[PDB]
Amino acid sequence: DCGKPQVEPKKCPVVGGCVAHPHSWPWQVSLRTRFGMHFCGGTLISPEWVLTAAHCLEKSPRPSSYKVILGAHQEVNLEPHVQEIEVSRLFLEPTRKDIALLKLSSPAVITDKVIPACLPSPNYVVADRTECFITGWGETQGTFGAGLLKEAQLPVIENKVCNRYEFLNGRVQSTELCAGHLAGGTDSCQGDAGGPLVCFEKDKYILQGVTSWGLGCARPNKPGVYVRVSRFVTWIEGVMRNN
Ligand SMILES: NCc1ccc(CNC(=O)[C@@H]2Cc3ccc(cc3)NC(=O)CCN3CCN(CCC(=O)Nc4ccc(cc4)C[C@@H](NS(=O)(=O)c4cccc(Cl)c4)C(=O)N2)CC3)cc1
């Protein structure tokens, strides 16, 4: 069962936001160098497949340079039941968009703490003001939580508005979506790239965005930009089916 956490997540009372309830985001992955340094996030979407951002892989096209950590809450002192799986192959999206698939060397073991996220239907458009969640271990910019998995609940901003001069001034593609608090203070940041933007739909969480870029982090009128997963579901499914 994708999208349904065994440990239920909690809202807040990553810059700002709050520390997640441990293991409430069981599809969250830590992308690390073959030396063990965290540098990006990802999302488990099936036992053998992780979705991340293509820019997270710019340094090396060799699958050997990457390892995936699953089931973690601490970033440094990894808990014992954490799964560390090597990457067997890399699939960059073929039209140069900021999304990529990692095929794991072995299927992740599905547990209470490691569960895949669900994928959306093709071309679904998250509606304006939908409150979704972003998660990760990235920079906190003096906001507490460093070293622990953090979350933030952010409203989606429809592309027609996000592209106005007052916000991102024509920079956002239809294959991307915008989310964030326009007053600033809470945002994904460096170290969170490649990680998930999930939305609650009926009874489970659906992966709708991949953390990609922004004009800074948590600045006023500068919401984060995410790859719009629904525009790549058909590609993703074809890669999994044929590999
Ligand atoms: N929730 C906020 C947030 C969350 C998580 C993060 C981590 N992710 C990054 O770090 C990305 C990495 C990256 C690089 C290239 C790329 C995609 C992602 N895609 C192409 O290469 C594809 C080719 N074209 C690129 C241009 N595009 C036109 C629209 C446009 O201009 N897109 C920008 C893209 C990158 C930047 C700026 C603009 C540069 C920097 N932004 S930054 O202001 O300098 C900065 C951010 C954070 C901290 C600091 Cl200190 C500085 C920036 O985000 N890099 C069309 C396609 C950051 C922000």
From Swiss-Prot:
Residues 14-241 form the Peptidase S1 domain. This is Plasmin light chain B. Disulfide bonds join 2-118, 12-18, 40-56, 132-199, 162-178, 189-217. Changing residue 184 to R: In PLGD; Kanagawa-1; 50% activity. It comes from Homo sapiens (Human). The chain holds residues 566 to 810 of 810 of the full protein. Changing residue 174 to A: Proteolytically cleaved, but abolishes plasmin activity and cell detachment. Prevents invasion of the mosquito vector midgut by parasite P.falciparum ookinetes. The modification Phosphoserine is found at residues 30, 121. The active site is at residues 55, 98, 193.
